[PDB]
Every structure is written in structure tokens, then in C-alpha cells.
Write a protein that binds this ligand. Structure first.
Ligand SMILES: Cc1cc(CCCOc2c(Cl)cc(C3=NCCO3)cc2Cl)on1
Ligand SMILES: Cc1cc(CCCOc2c(Cl)cc(C3=NCCO3)cc2Cl)on1
Lengths: 40, 255, 236, 273, 273, 59, 59, 57, 40, 40
């Protein structure tokens, strides 16, 4: 129950439960498959 | 017979071929794109010179020697004088751009050495004076020359200590930023595609640089016996999806 | 008027509680969000990116050189480096992994340790990396080392080798600040055959080493880091 | 969810553990690519590492102090701490600072808690009960010159009145100019040759001003204000390397000269355990 | 439910009262196996003997004390009780200890209540109103050295601020490393020849630190902290023999030498009533 | 603002009361339970196991 | 009696909060509204009317 | 809501920027009547300028 | 939920969301079209 | 009604109403019937 009118006044947000490290761990242009050779 | 290894990038009226690549990085897995309306604020129609600004400019070459500490260029600064890209830059109030960066360094199968090529969004430098000394404008706008981390402290300039990234963080952790290594034994180029990253939809191209490109020797250059002890490093950079807005009189900037 | 009773704890301020508050700026409209590449949602997303380990810690002032593990041509049977696995201390401590682990009290999971070789292309080498699970001493010679988790690495076209320290543990969590009961083992590396340089070449070659966490990893019970402190408030 | 699958002996032409780090990727290698594993489940979600959780607890961001005393003959109230201010900023204290600077841009609503306690360091008959008044002077607003000015009227300025010893709490929407707060800013206000450098030029959101409503009693009373800040509704972009050296200034990245080696030197060899 | 059924005379070949205790069983013999009984009902459920109930009321687990006084010239705040800590443990006080040690492994959430009262043993004009700050320094966290350190910032450390005379309350999830808390542990940290023995090596969950936020008034004020602990969501395994001798140490089973006979000697014969 | 009245007993701490409290460690995930033989639920379960009586108390 | 807990901020007066209050004049009937030309609803309505700029500020 | 619509070159007999202020009106002229604009949205309602808000603290 | 009986005791009103500047910006008797000549 | 998000913050648990002394009173491998001889 929100007792207040504005959105800033609500409690903390709830877990992204998004999670996708590939923008950080695999930003390569041509896709690399694990097990296939790195450099062909 | 496609290898990760050979590549061709054609952009505008200029083409680059590498026969010894190590894939290419696209920052944060996003490719440069123009500014959508839903994200727009300034009401001005923007100008998109296209092929006259989105081509490859090769900056002047550096020389890696056994004593090198590393070099640093800022964008869009490094290009402030390249062809029509630069003119547009001084003539509009606002502009926006992504880039393809291609760093080149070839040697032979007897050399060793490994450079880190990294792009740091919003690289705010530190004053070597400490306290709250600022880093004057000119010092953070070296132009095509870039900053040479093995040059001496100057007054009003930034600190040039490598194991601290010019800001109080350790060299070892720069790997959290989009980056690629050039290991003479593997690699001969590094290519990074940079999407436009800012907290505003479009900004000023002269009062704010939005990425520093940094090339840092990490495993020292080691040449074969009685080889000349140095290799040149060349940086070629191409603006991509550039847009300029708010045209007028032509900025005058310090120094 | 509805009858109430107040409980113990009334009026306390707990920095970790999460409740509603009146907005001081009623009706204000925040700036629209625009798109920015790079959004982070979990610290677990970022500790999977590998970063360099200053393994060569033997210097006396911080230098680019403590990231370089040297290799000597023609040595046989010998040991390249050694370290315990207290990820919250020692070599690990300044790495991004080490640096985040320190915001939490407990960790569990597998670690990924990789080595990238930087020697001339016409050289060759075979190294063995060994993980020694808790309970034995840091190995003293390869024979001892090779009886635990190990990988023979053959230096080739493929420049890096990724060793995993699989989670070997009785207790399902270990403390990030070094603790005995909770200790994780040792990591050592030895020549399997030996580094060989081509003609016209000389000196030391170096390995770069990285650390990142497997998708396996768990961190819990947040706390304050020993890695930062201060004596007076800063000002502008 | 499985944390590890079962995997047995391997003798392949398909080697997942050989890679080329020069590419910039961290290949997702697992225990089961290089040893024989058994199935195990995760039993865990990664709840407490969510950025909302990481930045979502109250941190002390500021300690100031004001006193209640006879202002008779004081030529400069501000200077007598008849009332103070704090040109708002979250870079002062470094505990919360390091955490925030793990990211480049950050966007969130703020919840402030203000604790005020009183001290009576010299002989008093009693402890008086004072009421504090915290008013946020938005930039371009009449700055309180005195302690009972016309400014304190704050007829358009959000202000809160609470008792010393007690706590005040509220929340503020994200009042950033842009789409997000810039944790770092490699630029200037304008193309000048002497203009400052950093964010200290970007983060100009006025200041908060405190004062004691009550007149003066016979003794003097020191009131010390602690402001706590909790981020709610957090959004963070572009992770960066953690802060290694100590901080010297609000808003610049500068570190102190002749600082000490931050990497612990081995007591022994590279070979040491 | 019947507590006893009706049963009458018996002349059988089936004798439920003869057993062999050497087997380790306690055969379930009832009044109706050996006398003639009448029906009666239980009227009772055994509600208040549930382990949740048995361990579920608040028990005092710790009393400490800190003082508010001028720290000017104090070389060791910790030592002046300018602030204290309590390397958390539930073995200190024996009342709750004996109860817990009825089991081998125990798992529960904790609810803490902290009562703080002030004393002014020597001449004061008044009673000041102090605000206490209890912060839990997880192991591997910067330990407060002073009373107004940077640690007290506790930007990532859960902390609570309440008034003296008042009470603070909250709850903590089961923060055990294992699947349950070890009430006993017949092992060591590692295979050493001098390493300690017991649980004192297993139960290393940092310590709690208290302090008074307020500066110093003209007099000195003693604040004494009492921590109460209530187990909620209890789970207990493997019952053991109750503690007979007195306790000597947190975490070891050791009893004092030349202790006294714990079984009451008869005043009379074996035959005595 | 809803009108309330507080009753006698407000603010007291009764060691035997059973109410909710804020968690100091929001979002923390406890270690999984594994199976352990021997769980006790009621003290009534254990007082049915017989134990020896020091009947010969005369020492 | 329903159990409650009061949070930080209890008793504060925030000049910008918006809550209900008892009416001091229970049951009073205000004067009827009549029509008046000119009602303003938003300050945004009025800043669109142009006004003169003292551009010649040099006096 | 659009804050500005897209508008391009103009060469007309229809001039929205010439008016007669003597009339007492403020003619509703927009950026797009005199420069070439691109679409942009308002993202804003004017909530905090309502007179209830202005006099309500 | 109103807890009180009288209307004066309720909280602040809610946004007009009325907005019509023409009584102030264009109170002319004969309608002016933008683009058409001001004075004919 | 739970007012709080985390499970640790809820009140005491509710009676096992489990109760099975046989793991403690009759842990014998071959089942003993009351009335039948203990040792056959
Ligand atoms: C980063 C960052 C975040 C902020 C906060 C902005 C200022 O926020 C406040 C507002 Cl809008 C109002 C009040 C306030 N209103 C009544 C009492 O206090 C206090 C603050 Cl800090 O500044 N830098
Ligand atoms: C057995 C046993 C149980 C415990 C309790 C563990 C520590 O729990 C606490 C936590 Cl996680 C936080 C706080 C606390 N946070 C803010 C104030 O106090 C206090 C304690 Cl005791 O230790 N041994």
C-alpha cells in the first residue's frame, strides 16, 4: 500500500533479476564459441 | 576460409585491411546509431555529413621503445583538426558521434611485447599536485598529439603515473573497460567500435571529451638480437553516425 | 480513534530498513531517461569479467612489473610462481574480484584463473598449473603438485589457458577475510618441459595472469571494505 | 538451477580451455570443462548483490554543527555557527563515495534521515529542548544571512522542523538536470583556459541550511547534525575500476603525492605461498 | 485423545512388562499394562514444550557498558569505554546456554532487543539525552579505532540509532556458514599441534560495537547496554545429556577443578524415604 | 493521517511476546539445509527415553 | 489494541507534506461560489502572455 | 505529446511570424514557424505549476 | 480514505489539468488565424 | 499480515505438532513388539 502520492516516496525497488554479463564479458563483434578455436 | 584474423573495414572513401586481427570489440555490445526522436530534446533538425566526416583519419605515429610508459588520446579532441569532421565540430553548438578505432603495430615472430588498447568512458584525469588543484583545459585537449605518459609533470597538467590510470585506480583493472590486447606473437592490430555514451542526448564537442583511448605497453617490447630497439604504433580513427546541431558562428577555444 | 500499542524498537533508525517517506518536492517531474549502453544490474555481472593479478608482488613500490610473471629459458622441473587462495587478501586483493569480494562477508563458487603467454611466436613451452585443495601444504615440487587439480598447458597459437579452481569444500561458504577453517588451498605453476627461445632471441619472457569468478559464484552478507578510509571530511 | 552438471572423462579435438585473451572476451569456462564433476544445485539467487541492494542502505554523508546562543552582538551568524549549511554533495565522506564511483552514471531517488543530538560542554542547569529547521535553498534562492531572516519563512522552499535528539526523514525525487548523475565528467563548464575541471562544476544543486528555532537560554547548547542518505530506485551504467588511492577533494579524481604502495609486497618470493 | 483406556484383569502368556534394556530401546509401557485402568482423556497437546516455544523467548545474552565523556587526551578510546564491542557469542551467559546445549546442531533466525539505561554516579545538574549507535562489524571489516572514526559511517554495515532508556529491535536471518550452528565441535581449524579446540574456532562471526553519538556534556554519563536474544524459526537436531557441572569458558566444555558433588547425598539409607 | 490512541503497555518489552521486526540484513540468502538424522520437535519426545537414576545416593 | 512501531520522522513537520486534519469549524457552510471571469489554473497559462522587456536598461 | 513537430524549408505567402501586437493578443508562434525542426516529445505535464501546488505548501 | 467528516479537512486537491491560456493570450473579439494577415 | 519483506522478520513459528519419539526410544534394527519376548 503506498500512503503517499509521489513515486519517489515508495520503498526500495525489488530485484532486477535481470543479469546479463555478456555486454561486459563478451563484447566481441564475431561470436566466439567455447571449444572452437579462438583464432581461426 | 574466413578467419577471425583477416578483416576489411570500409567507411566512407577509406578502407583498412588487417591480415592479423583478434576479433573486434563493440563497446557494451552496442553499435553506434543516430539519435532517436524519443530521446531528443533540442528541437533543431541535425546535420549528418555522412561520408565526408565518417571516414578514417590516421593520427601521427608513436614510437614504442623499451622505455615507453603509454599514450592517451581524448575523443572528439584527437580529431578536432581532421578535414570536415573538425570544421563541423567548431561550427555547431552540439554534435554527437560513435567511432571505429583501429590501433596498428606489426613486428616479427622474434619480437615480444604486448600493448593494452582500452576505451574509458568519462576519463576524468587527476592533477599531480593533489588536493583540489584542477587540470587546465589545454592539458586535457592535446589534440592529435595525445598525452605521453612518459613526458614530465607540467603545471596545470594531469598526473602521468601509469599504474594509476591517471585517476587513482589500478592499471590491472582497466580490463573492466572495453579493450583488446596487441600481443606481437598473436595480434598486430586492435579494433574497437564505440557507440555514443553520455548522460545527455547530445552535448558540446569542445567542452567535454567522452572517451579517452589509451594504448599502454604492459609486457615490455623485446626485439631480436641486434634489431633496432623500437616499433612505431599508428592509431587510425573514424567518426561513425556523426550528427551536428545548432550551427552558428564558430567556437573559439583556449590556446 | 483506533486503539494501538507501540512495540520495542519504536523510534529507532536502522540504516537497512526500507519504508515509505513523504516527498519533499511534491509533484516534481524528473528528467526523462535516455538510453545509455552499459547498464549494470548485479555485482555478479561484473565479477565475471577478468582482470590482471599483480602476481609478481615482490617489488617495493607499485609498478607495471608486478603484473609480469617472468619465465626463464631452459630451466627444467622448476617452479614458476605460488600463492595461497585468500581471494580477499594478498595478490587478489586489488583485482576487481578481490575488490568486490571485500564488500561481502562470505563467498562460495568456482574461480577462473587464466595465463596469457607473451613470448616470441617462434618459442615454445609446456607448463603445469596445479590447484591444491585445503588440507595439504603448498606443493614443494611438481611431483607433489601434479597429484591435485592440474592442467598441462602447451603454449601455442592459442595464447591463453583458462584454469578453473573448482569449488572444493566441506562447508558451503568461506569467509572473504582470510580464515583458517575456511581456507581454500594453493595455486602453483611449474615447467612441464621448459621454455625454449628461437635463435637471435634472448632473456626473460612474461606471462600475464587474470582472475574472474565462474557463474557458480555466490557472495553474501554485505559489509564495509577495509580498502578505503579517511581522517577528515573532504571539501571542494 | 544447476551449479555444476555431471561430466566425465574427455579426449577431444574440442578444447574449451584454450582461448586468446587478446580479443577482449572472458570466455565462460566452468569446472566441468576441465575436471570430472557431479551435479550440484545453486540454492541461491544473487539477491543481495543487486545494485538496488548495494546502494540502498543509509550511509552517513555529512556531519555539521550549529549552536544556540545569544546572538546579541554577533556580526556574522554564519560564522558563529548560529546556523550552518552544507553545499550539498555526496563526495564528502568516502565510504559511500567509493561504492558509487564503481559506476560512471547513476540515477536514483534519495531518502534523507537527519539525526540531531545536543551537547552541553560547559555547566548548564539543564538540557533545553530545541527544534531544528532544515531548509533547502535551491540555487538562485535568497541565502539566509541571519538566523531569523525572512528566508527562514521558506514559503516556497521545502523545510522540515524536528526536535533535537529526534530524527527527520523524507525523500527526494531524482533532481538531476540530465538523465542521470555524472559520477565522473571529463569536461568543463565552458571553453575557458582557467575554468575548473570535473563534476564539481556539474553538481551545483544549491545547499541545505540548518538552524535552531528556539531563542537562547542562559547556557550554550551545541547541536551536531548528521545527514544519512539512502538511494532508492537505483539505475547504474558503465562499471569502472574501483578506487585504489585515497581521495583528496570533493569532485576531483586527484590522489595525494608520495602516497604508499597500494599492492601488498610479498614476504618472500614469487614462489612463496 | 485418550490418556488411558479402560483395561481389566489379565492372566496371559503375553507379558508386556518384561523386557531386555540391553537392546537400547525404551519399550512403550503404559499404566494399563500392569494395573486395571478406566478411560480418561488427555485434554492437552504439548504445545509449550515445542522447541520453537522452548527457545523462543528473549534471554539476556550480554551486558556491556560505554561512557560519554570528554575524549580530549584519551589515547585509547576503546580502553576508556568511549566505545565498546562484544565479539558476538551466545555462550557468555549460562541460562540460555544450558537450554541450547540440550541439542548438538541448532538453526534459527535471531531477534535482538537492546535496552540501554543511563547512570550518573557523580554529581550532574541533569540527565542528558544520548543516542546510541550499534553497528555490526562483519569479520574482515574496518574495526572502529576511535569513537568518531570513518568506520561509524557504516555505509555498508547495518547499524541502528536509538535513545538511551529506549529499546532497539530487529532481527537477523540465520547467518551460519553451514546448514546449522554447531553447539559442539570435536575438531580443529586445521591439522596443527597447537591450534585451539572447540567451536570457539567455528563461531567467528565478528563483533557488535556500541557508542554514544552525542558529544560530551560537563558531567560524565555511564550507559550500560543489555542485549536480549530470541530464537525464531527454530530447528534442533540430536538431543544430548544436560549440563551437570558449572561452565568456565565460552566455547569449551571444560568444568572447574574440585567442583562439588552434583548428585545430592541421601540423609539416611538407600532404604530411606 | 488516521487518528489513534495508545494503550497502557505501549513501549514495554515483554521477553515472551512474539512480533515482527525489520531484518538488519535485507536480502541475504541463508545456507541451504541438508538432512541431519535426529531432529527433535518436542521436549515430550525426549523425556520418553529412559536414563539411569543414581538411586544409591549414599556416597 | 493493535501493535504498532513508529518510524524515524515521526512528529516532524515538513512544510510540503499533504495530509488530513480535523476541521476547527465542524459543520460550517462556506459561501456559494458565483462565476468570475479569469480563472487561472497553471502558472504555465500566464507565462504565455507577452509583456514588455526594459531592454534599454542604460538609465 | 509532441513538443516540436518536424518541419522543413518554407517559401510561402502565409507568414505566421508577422503580427500586429496592437490587438492585445499573443499569437501562438512556435520554433517550427521560423526554423526547420525535428520531432521531440514533451515528457512533462506541468504538474508543479498548478496553482494548488504553488499555494499549497 | 477520509478520516474526517468535513471537506476542509481533506488533503490538497489534485491537478487541474485544465490549462487554457486563450482567455489571457487571445481575448480578441474577431478570431485571428496564425499565418493570415493580422490586419486586413 | 507480514509487514516486512524478509522471512527472518516474521514472528515465531507455530507448533511442529510433529512428535515421533521412536527415533530416540526404539532405534532397534529388528522391530520389537510389546508383549512378545524381548530376546527369542
Ligand atoms: C548526487 C546528489 C544528490 C543530491 C540531492 C539533491 C538535493 O536534495 C534535497 C532536496 Cl531537493 C530537499 C531537501 C530538503 N527539503 C526539506 C528538507 O530537506 C534536502 C535535499 Cl538534500 O545532491 N547531489
Ligand atoms: C550463535 C550465534 C548467533 C549469532 C548472531 C550473528 C550476528 O548477528 C547480528 C547481525 Cl547479522 C547484525 C546485527 C546488527 N545490525 C545492526 C545492529 O545490530 C547484530 C547481530 Cl548480533 O552469532 N552467534
Amino acid at each position: 500500500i503506498n500512503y503517499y502520492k509521489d513515486a519517489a516516496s515508495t520503498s526500495s525497488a525489488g530485484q532486477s533479476l535481470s543479469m546479463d554479463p555478456s555486454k561486459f564479458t563478451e563484447p566481441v563483434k564475431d561470436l566466439m564459441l567455447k571449444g572452437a578455436p579462438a583464432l581461426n | 576460409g574466413y578467419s577471425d584474423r583477416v578483416q576489411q573495414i570500409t567507411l566512407g572513401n577509406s578502407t583498412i585491411t588487417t591480415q592479423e586481427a583478434a576479433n573486434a570489440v563493440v563497446c557494451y555490445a552496442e553499435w553506434p546509431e543516430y539519435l532517436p526522436d524519443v530521446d531528443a530534446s533540442d528541437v533543431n533538425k541535425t546535420s549528418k555529413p555522412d561520408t565526408s566526416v565518417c571516414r578514417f583519419y590516421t593520427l601521427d605515429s608513436k614510437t614504442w621503445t623499451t622505455g615507453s610508459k603509454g599514450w592517451c588520446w581524448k575523443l572528439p579532441d584527437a580529431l578536432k583538426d581532421m578535414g570536415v569532421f573538425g570544421q563541423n565540430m567548431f561550427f555547431h553548438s552540439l554534435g554527437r558521434s560513435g567511432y571505429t578505432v583501429h590501433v596498428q603495430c606489426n613486428a616479427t615472430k622474434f619480437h615480444s611485447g604486448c600493448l593494452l588498447v582500452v576505451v574509458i568512458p568519462e576519463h576524468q584525469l587527476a592533477s599531480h599536485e593533489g588536493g583540489n588543484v584542477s587540470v587546465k583545459y589545454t592539458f586535457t585537449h592535446p589534440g592529435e598529439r595525445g598525452i605521453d605518459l612518459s613526458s614530465a609533470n607540467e603545471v596545470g597538467g594531469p598526473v602521468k603515473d601509469v599504474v594509476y590510470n591517471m585517476n587513482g585506480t589500478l592499471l590491472g583493472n582497466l580490463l573492466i573497460f572495453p579493450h583488446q590486447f596487441i600481443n606481437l606473437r598473436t595480434n598486430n592490430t586492435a579494433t574497437i567500435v564505440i557507440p555514443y555514451i553520455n548522460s545527455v542526448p547530445i552535448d558540446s564537442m569542445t567542452r567535454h571529451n567522452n572517451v579517452s583511448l589509451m594504448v599502454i605497453p604492459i609486457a615490455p617490447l623485446t626485439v631480436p638480437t641486434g634489431a633496432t630497439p623500437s616499433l612505431p604504433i599508428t592509431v587510425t580513427i573514424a567518426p561513425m553516425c556523426t550528427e551536428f546541431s545548432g550551427i552558428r558562428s564558430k567556437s573559439i577555444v583556449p590556446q | 480513534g483506533l486503539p494501538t500499542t507501540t512495540l520495542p524498537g519504536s523510534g529507532q533508525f536502522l540504516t537497512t530498513d526500507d519504508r515509505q517517506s513523504p516527498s519533499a518536492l511534491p509533484n516534481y517531474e524528473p528528467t526523462p531517461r535516455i538510453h545509455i549502453p552499459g547498464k549494470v544490474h548485479n555485482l555478479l555481472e561484473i565479477i565475471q569479467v577478468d582482470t590482471l593479478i599483480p602476481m609478481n608482488n615482490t617489488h617495493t613500490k607499485d609498478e607495471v612489473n608486478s603484473y609480469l610473471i617472468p619465465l626463464n629459458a631452459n630451466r627444467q622441473n622448476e617452479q614458476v610462481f605460488g600463492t595461497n587462495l585468500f581471494i580477499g587478501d594478498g595478490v587478489f586483493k586489488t583485482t576487481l574480484l578481490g575488490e568486490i569480494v571485500q564488500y561481502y562477508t562470505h563467498w562460495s563458487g568456482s574461480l577462473r584463473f587464466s595465463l596469457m603467454y607473451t613470448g616470441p611466436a617462434l618459442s615454445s613451452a609446456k607448463l603445469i598449473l596445479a590447484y591444491t585443495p585445503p588440507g595439504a601444504r603448498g606443493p614443494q615440487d611438481r611431483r607433489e603438485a601434479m597429484l591435485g587439480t592440474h592442467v598441462v598447458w602447451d603454449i601455442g597459437l592459442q595464447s591463453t589457458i583458462v584454469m578453473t579452481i573448482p569449488w572444493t569444500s566441506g562447508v558451503q561458504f568461506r569467509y572473504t577475510d582470510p580464515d583458517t577453517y575456511t581456507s581454500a588451498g594453493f595455486l602453483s605453476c611449474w615447467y612441464q618441459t621448459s621454455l625454449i627461445l628461437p635463435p637471435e632471441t634472448t632473456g626473460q619472457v612474461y606471462l600475464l595472469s587474470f582472475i574472474s569468478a565462474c557463474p557458480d559464484f555466490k557472495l553474501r552478507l554485505m559489509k564495509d571494505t577495509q580498502t578505503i578510509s579517511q581522517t577528515v571530511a573532504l571539501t571542494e | 538451477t544447476v551449479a555444476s552438471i555431471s561430466s566425465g572423462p574427455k579426449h577431444t579435438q574440442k578444447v574449451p580451455i584454450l582461448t586468446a585473451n587478446e580479443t577482449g572476451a572472458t570466455m565462460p569456462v566452468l569446472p566441468s570443462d576441465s575436471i570430472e564433476t557431479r551435479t550440484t544445485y545453486m540454492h541461491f539467487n544473487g539477491s543481495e548483490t543487486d545494485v538496488e541492494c548495494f546502494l540502498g542502505r543509509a550511509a552517513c554523508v555529512h556531519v555539521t554543527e550549529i549552536q544556540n546562543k545569544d546572538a546579541t552582538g554577533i556580526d556574522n551568524h554564519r560564522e558563529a555557527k548560529l546556523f550552518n549549511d552544507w553545499k550539498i554533495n555526496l563526495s564528502s565522506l568516502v565510504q559511500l563515495r567509493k561504492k558509487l564511483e564503481l559506476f560512471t552514471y547513476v540515477r536514483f531517488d534519495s531518502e534523507y534521515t537527519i539525526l540531531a543530538t545536543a551537547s552541553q560542554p560547559d555547566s548548564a542547569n539543564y538540557s533545553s529542548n530545541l527544534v531544528v529547521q532544515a531548509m533547502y535553498v535551491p540555487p538562485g534562492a535568497p541565502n539566509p544571512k541571519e538566523w531569523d531572516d525572512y528566508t527562514w519563512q521558506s514559503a516556497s522552499n521545502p523545510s522540515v522542523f524536528f526536535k533535537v535528539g529526534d530524527t527527520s526523514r523524507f525523500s527526494v525525487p531524482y533532481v538531476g538536470l540530465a538523465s542521470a548523475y555524472n559520477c565522473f565528467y571529463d569536461g568543463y563548464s565552458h571553453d575557458d583556459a582557467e575554468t575548473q575541471y570535473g563534476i564539481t562544476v556539474l553538481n551545483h544543486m544549491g545547499s541545505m541550511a540548518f538552524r535552531i528555532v528556539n531563542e537562547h537560554d542562559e547556557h550554550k547548547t551545541l547541536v551536531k547534525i548528521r545527514v544519512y542518505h539512502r538511494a532508492k530506485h537505483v539505475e547504474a551504467w558503465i562499471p569502472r575500476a574501483p578506487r585504489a588511492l585515497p581521495y583528496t577533494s570533493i569532485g576531483r579524481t586527484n590522489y595525494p603525492k608520495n602516497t604508499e604502495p597500494v599492492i601488498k609486497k610479498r614476504k618472500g618470493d614469487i614462489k612463496s605461498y
